[PDB]
Amino acid sequence: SGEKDVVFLIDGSEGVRSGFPLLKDFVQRVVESLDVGPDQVRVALVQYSDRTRPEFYLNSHMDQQGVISAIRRLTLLGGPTPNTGAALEFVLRNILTSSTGSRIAEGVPQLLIVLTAEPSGDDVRGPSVVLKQGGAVPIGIGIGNADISEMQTISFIPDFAVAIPTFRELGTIQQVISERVIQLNREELSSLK
C-alpha cells in the first residue's frame, strides 16, 4: 500500500443501532488487511449523528492490534439523524491535519471511508466539494436506506460510491475496499480529476 492515511467516518445515529456490530466487524476486517504503523498506514475513526465525536486520530494508535482493539470497544454514539455534511467538514478541519498525525502536507493520500444507512439529515453537496478541494479522497458506502446519489456526491468521483443492501453484505465488499486503500496512489488520484 505504501503510506496512506485512512479515516473511517461512521454514522452512529439510531438508524445504525441494529447494524453497529456488523459495522465494527467490517472496519476491523478492512484494518486487518492493512500494514498499520507510524511509518506505514495510519488509521483514524470518527462517529457522527447530529454531532461529531472523534474516537481516535491518525497518531493515536499506530499498531494494528491497538487500532483493532479501539474499534472493538466502540459504543454507538446515538442521535436522531446523520448530519453527514457537517461530519465531512469536521473531518477535513480537525482530522486531516498535521497536528493530529495526517501526512497530508507530504502528499500522502487521505482516504476517507464513509459508512451510513440513511439519507443525510443535512445537505452534503457543499461539504462534498470542500472536502475534495481540501485533498480528501472519499469512498461513500451507503447501506440499506442510504441514497446512492448522496454517496456519489460525497465520493472522490461518483464511481467510487458503493451501495449495499444490508449490513450483513458488508463482508462482501471488505476485499474490494481493502484493495482500494492498498492500490490507490497519489499520481493515479491526480489523474482522475
Author numbering: 1022 to 1214
Give the authors' words.
Collagen VI is a ubiquitously expressed extracellular matrix protein that forms a structurally unique network of beaded microfilaments. All collagen VI chains consist of a relatively short triple-helical region as well as of N- and C-terminal globular structures that are largely made up of VWA domains. Von Willebrand factor A (VWA) domains consist of about 200 amino acid residues and act as interaction modules in many intra- and extracellular proteins, e.g., in copines, integrins, von Willebrand factor, complement factors B and C2, matrilins, and collagens. The collagen VI α3N5 domain structure is the first solved structure of a collagen VWA domain and differs from other VWA domains in having an extended C-terminal region comprising residues N1206–G1224.
One of these missense mutations, R1064Q in human (R1064Qh) that is located in the N5 domain, was found in an UCMD patient (Lampe et al., 2005). To gain insight into the UCMD causing mechanism of the R1064Q mutant in human, the equivalent mutation R1061Qm in mouse was inserted into the murine collagen VI α3N5 domain by mutagenesis PCR and the crystal structure of the corresponding recombinant protein was determined at 1.2 Å resolution. The overall structure of the mutant VWA domain is very similar to the wild-type collagen VI α3N5 domain with an rmsd of 0.54 Å. The most significant structural difference is around the C terminus where the α6 helix of the mutant has a small angle with respect to the wild-type leading to a 1.5 Å displacement of the helix in the C-terminal extension. Poor electron density after residue L1213 in the mutant precluded the unambiguous assignment of the remainder of the C-terminal extension residues K2014–G2024. The residue of the R1061Qm mutation is preceding the beginning of the β2 strand and is located near the N terminus. Comparison of the wild-type and mutant structures shows that the side chains of the wild-type arginine and mutant glutamine are surface exposed and are pointing in approximately opposite directions while the remainder of the local conformation is the same. The crystal packing of the R1061Qm collagen VI α3N5 domain is different from the wild-type. While the arginine residue in the wild-type is in close proximity to the α2α3 loop of the neighboring molecule, the glutamine residue of the R1061Qm mutant interacts with the C-terminal part of the adjacent molecule (data not shown). The charge difference in the mutant and the difference in crystal packing also indicate the possibility that this mutation may alter intra- or intermolecular interactions and therefore disturb the assembly of collagen VI.
